[PDB]
Amino acid sequence: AMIRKYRYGAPFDTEALTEKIETAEEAFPYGEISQKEGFAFTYIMDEDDIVYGLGESNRGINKRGYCYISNCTDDPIHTEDKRSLYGAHNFIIVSGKTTFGLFFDYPSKLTFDIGYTRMDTLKVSCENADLDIYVIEGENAYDIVKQFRRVIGRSYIPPKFAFGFGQSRWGYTTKEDFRAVAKGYRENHIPIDMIYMDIDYMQDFKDFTVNEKNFPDFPEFVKEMKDQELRLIPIIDAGVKVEKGYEVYEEGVKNNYFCKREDGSDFVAAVWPGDTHFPDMLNPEARKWFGDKYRFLIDQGIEGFWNAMNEPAIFYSSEGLAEAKEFAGEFAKDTEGKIHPWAMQAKMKDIVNSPEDYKRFYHNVNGKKIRHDKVHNLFGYNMTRAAGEAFERIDPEKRFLMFSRSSYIGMHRYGGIWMGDNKSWWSHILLNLKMLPSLNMCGFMYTGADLGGFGDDTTRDLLLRFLALGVFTPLMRDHAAECYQFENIEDFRSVINARYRLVPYLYSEYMKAALNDDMYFKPLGFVYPDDKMAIRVEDQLMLGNEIMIAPVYEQNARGRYVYLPEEMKFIKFMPDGSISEEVLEKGVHYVDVALNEVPLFIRSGKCIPVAEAAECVKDIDTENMQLIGYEGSSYTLYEDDGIHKDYDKKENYRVLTK
Amino acid sequence: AMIRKYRYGAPFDTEALTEKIETAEEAFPYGEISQKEGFAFTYIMDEDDIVYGLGESNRGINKRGYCYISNCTDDPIHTEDKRSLYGAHNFIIVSGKTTFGLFFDYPSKLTFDIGYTRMDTLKVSCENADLDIYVIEGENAYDIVKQFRRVIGRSYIPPKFAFGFGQSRWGYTTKEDFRAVAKGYRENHIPIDMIYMDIDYMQDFKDFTVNEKNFPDFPEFVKEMKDQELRLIPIIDAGVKVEKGYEVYEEGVKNNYFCKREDGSDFVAAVWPGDTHFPDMLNPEARKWFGDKYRFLIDQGIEGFWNAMNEPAIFYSSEGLAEAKEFAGEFAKDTEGKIHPWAMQAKMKDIVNSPEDYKRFYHNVNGKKIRHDKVHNLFGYNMTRAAGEAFERIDPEKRFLMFSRSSYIGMHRYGGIWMGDNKSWWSHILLNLKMLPSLNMCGFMYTGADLGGFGDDTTRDLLLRFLALGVFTPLMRDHAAQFENIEDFRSVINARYRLVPYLYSEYMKAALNDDMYFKPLGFVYPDDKMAIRVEDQLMLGNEIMIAPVYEQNARGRYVYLPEEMKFIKFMPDGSISEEVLEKGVHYVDVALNEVPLFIRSGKCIPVAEAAECVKDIDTENMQLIGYEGSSYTLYEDDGIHKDYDKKENYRVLTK
């Protein structure tokens, strides 16, 4: 009925959809198809149309006016003109006079030209006609989203402590390092629940090993942190150090579980341990094997993991180094002057994340050898899928905090996503704002962002406004790839206290959203669809059905412009400890927000619950909460033990009335 | 008692300011000075303090919360993290309770840590304690600016044709290309006045030559273009090609006009020609010899020039090239994996615009041999000085278009400044927006910006906004390194010409008054606590305020009106929409091909009819938009010469 599936060629099953829709046999109902140059789709948009989605992808919530290319890559520099971020979320709503949604179930290089070559023209293409095209009717954009949400399955749900706050640096290497963070926060009284561990804890960066020199009794140290409510969340990477003696290597080579070269040799890429191998994350039997190895950490009392470099990030193949060194040879000996620097420098960038490497290894998918580039956008998803499915087999009752980098629709069921990295800019505060609804639409709701940072290119004031946004993002971490190493820490504790008074509500909204296949964040145009101003707004988000966030994202700003499409109450989490309220009429306002003040808006006839600031998710008292909002309203607070897969019950639901 | 200079060590003479100020002998008034390591000045600033200044530098009108190093550099990428752009404009003003401006006259690397390390702390340090620090006192920040403007000497003025539109493409080579552009604009009646020639117009990139093959009768072709009111504005690079029998190479080598190595021989840098030398621009005689060279073109019909790669940019030195080749051949023989591919890649970056190479050559300042690094930030300035002084020595009564990349305060008296990288970002409309007040504080009034472009990445919408901004900027040009619905491009270029006479009058009034074109809102309305923080809007003249749209697919934008104002829009049909708005916050619809501006309580402005070149503009009978009963004093002159100080030049108009 409401969704149809138009199939071309022999599509590779991506297990995106948990609903098996059958192959509709009529002509494609929107625009022209052309298989002239591979495969192409061509909708002519009405001037008034808004394009929604593509999950994690550049630019605005309304995507018109630029190209975007589904292809999972590691740029570290996320500039206004890059075509490919980390995820490949192939789902867009054309919302205007004529309205529909289109998931493009394709695992390779998909190019979306949304009014870039020609401003009324929408053109999606790819090199091969082997893909499924799901077409989704609807009353409006939101409705189309909640349809798609139903068929991609339920979105992954995190343990409650994952809604706590989290610290990390890419440099912490000893017991002494982590201990400082602890001392740091706990002594100065800054709420925290998780500390992140980065590659340096690993035995020469080997996967599933801990440093035996700085961590001789690691499970004992894990207790020492857990005892203070400080769950360590270690990193895991796609590459496996080639090393004689090392088990994970030896088993992966013995048993044919690595991605191979065409002749059959285990392929070598080069990462943090240098010479790596990759798990063939599309061989179910290798997926199982890898997933199962996390048991080595879980057993030491680890309750959470994150995946990085699952693009897969390659620094250089064994092949690319050999041509590189050739060309440097030829360059060093040229005296006639015909190999200029820029071409030597260009071959250097060429060997990084090389399109020519991704055609040099293969996945063994139940009988078939399939060259990676054909299934490139599937590796991170399947790596994340290998972990989640191992959590079910290893401890089925308990939820683990899992979140990865590279992504694909279908992944949303096994962990979250962290929105990106590597420079500390103000434009990112807003770049990360506009990614959320799109991530929501494609089922990624447990997301959050990171402030890379060329040195300490991270100024006190950036960090505050940044944390101000994070307060609302289900994932909220500080990871320098501290609050207590600045001036006026009382300013940080305030922003972080605000997080913890909202943990009971934000969880309730996340849990409710996930269980019902609905949206945690929404653009304004989902909630106020018949207001032509509202629909064009790009820097304020609706969360659940109760509130509206408009973070400050300008440097040195002392407050920002807002439009309210209905009466709202203007709340400010104050440093002093109090909560200011002010009733604002529908429309255009300027609102004074201070670096140390965390802002939000309660809608007319609504209320949220607000706890007393606490120092960890365990010690939050969710009994006698104060009800902020409007003087009649009632709110439905979802709340569980927060550790187990136990969601359907009636004890969770509880109706609070202001 | 209004300005003081404090001298430390033995400060190089940079010819920044035209006024002599006597060395002061009392204490340093603000913060602390320290010679402990190099030189350092440290100020603890109030929570409310706004900091203005630094002309062409990063981020906002308020500098606070970041770091800025004056080190004229050529970076393709201009992201928020960059510390060095192209200018070395070392003027700052603290605007709070206590209020005072500083000019740090020092010619080398000068780091402004303006609340980046600690929020309360403004620290300004440098490596050799040999500099003048000028303190300007004053009531508002604005007076402190109007005072700095007096002592740095009057700004450059371009001929009036500069106030039209310019089109350009790097890669134009042949007559046929140019002819096309002429035809394009002229048959489709889009207004234009200048067609830029990038380095492809030369003969194997040789400074001061023309491609004898592509242009056999050059002055006749310059004449072809000028008869369509189209001045050619050719480019000139700092580097002079190394070539046997090359006329400017020959002269340069003989009588010792290039920068030399320490070993005593002429220093070699690779640029577009490959192996070049650098005219020693701090040496007064090479400046005369070099500047006089412009005569070549000026004698063919050319009436404006533009200088680039004048930091000076170095792709690599002969020394670098050898040390890199050295490293590769090792990388090439490594198997033990000790030389990593990122060391290789990193070594290749470093030999471009290299620190080591900037101290590899020297200058001959009147017989003293200074090492370039000690004065890096003046090179630009002086190359630009050389052509403008030459100009005075050819025809002191004719203005020549002149603009440069690099600069140091002082250059503002000689030409203007153009900003832009090779990228087309929405973020750059606001970046350039923010940049203009600050350049106007440092004398640089004739500035404009570029969508220097990643080539294909300029959409119709981004371009149409960029120009809508460029309408107001004195340099308006479309130089990308044909796009659909030409009828929207022309509407915007019309809005420009209709405003050319006001824009020009309000410009001339400023130039001659040691005053400001673009002012920040905090400068016109210093007691509005709200105004002093607006950054995305500007106060052109004393009549209007610009506030352009810089967000994609936006169909309007917020504004703050510090007082009551007329909301003027320049409609494509050619009409002008008009609406009164009260003091306070406002959303306003601005469609893609719409050009907006606000006119102030009891002010009005002159609006000409549509024209195609600046020459054919009916200024004698113009309409007045604005408020009934108000008066605008209009400046006009012949636009070509230096008959400024005349009272017939002004004419009061009344709406």
Work out the widest C-alpha separation in chain B, in whole angstroms.
Answer: 85
Task: Mark residue B539 as left, alpha or beta (left: phi above 0; alpha: psi -120 to 50; beta: remaining).
Answer: beta
What is the C-alpha to C-alpha distance for residues A9 and B253, in angstroms, rounded to an integer? 70
Spell out which residues of chain A touch residue B551, defining contact as CB-CB under 8 Å. 538
After what residues is chain A interrupted, C–N > 2.5 A? 481
Which residues in chain A touch residue B80, judged by CB atoms under 8 angstroms apart? 423, 425-427
The residue length of chain B stands at: 655
Residue pair A503/A490 in contact by the 8 Å Cβ criterion: no
**Among all residues of chain A, which has the CA nearest to that of B536?**
A554
Whole-number Å distance between alpha carbons of B341 and A321: 8
Distance CA A338, CA B325 (A): 13
Q: What DSSP line would sit under B51-106, residue for residue?
A: EEE-SS-SS-SS--SEEEEE-----S---TT----SEE--EEEEESSSEEEEEEE-
Cβ distance of B533 and A555 shorter than 8 Å? no
Q: Cβ B459–A77 below 8 Å, yes or no?
A: no
Tell me how far apart the alpha carbons of residues A428 and A430 are, in angstroms, rounded to a whole number: 5
- Count other Cβ atoms within 10 Å, centred on residue A28: 14
B603 contacts B543 by C-beta, under 8 angstroms:
yes
Q: How far is CA A478 from CA A180, A403, B426, B587, in A?
A: 15, 15, 28, 36
Contact B283, B259 (CB under 8 A): no
Neighbours of A590 (CB within 10 A): 14
Nearest CA in chain A to B83: A457
Is the Cβ pair B344, A328 closer than 8 Å? yes
Q: What is the DSSP string of A541-564?
A: EEETTTEEE----STT-S-EEEEE
**Nearest-10 crossing angle of helices B486-512, B460-470:** 20
Calpha distance B646→B649 (Å, rounded): 6
Residue A447: phi and psi, rounded to 5, are -135, 165
Which residues on chain B are in Cβ contact (under 8 Å) with A321? 341
Q: What approach was used to elucidate this structure?
A: X-ray
Q: Residues, chain A, total?
A: 658
Strand, coil or helix: A94: strand
Residue type for position B290: F
- Report the C-alpha gap between B371 and B589 in whole angstroms: 55
CA atoms within 13 A on the CB side of B349: 10
CA distances from A96 to A45, A48, A600, A625 (A): 9, 6, 29, 42
CB pairs under 8 A between A and B: 139
3-state secondary structure B511-547: HHCCCCCEECHHHHCCCCCCHHHCCCCEEECCCEEEC
Rounded to an integer, what is the distance from CA A197 to the centroid of its chain? 18
Of B59, B80, B325, the CB nearest to A331: B325
**CB atoms near residue B635 (< 10 Å):** 19
List chain A residues with CB under 8 Å of B329.
Answer: 328-329, 332-333
Residues of B in contact with A117 (CB under 8 A): none
Q: Is A487 in contact with B120 (Cβ distance < 8 A)?
A: yes
Under 8 Å between Cβ of A378 and A280: no
Beta strand pairing status for A304-308 and A401-404? Answer: parallel
CB contact under 8 Å between A425 and B80, yes or no, is yes
- Please name the helix (run of DSSP H) or strand (run of DSSP E) that holds residue B567, with its range, or none: strand B565-570
Q: Which two tokens stand for residue A34?
A: 């052309």
Question: Domains in chain B, ordered, with CATH?
Answer: 1-154 (2.60.40.1760), 155-528 (3.20.20.80), 529-655 (2.60.40.4040)
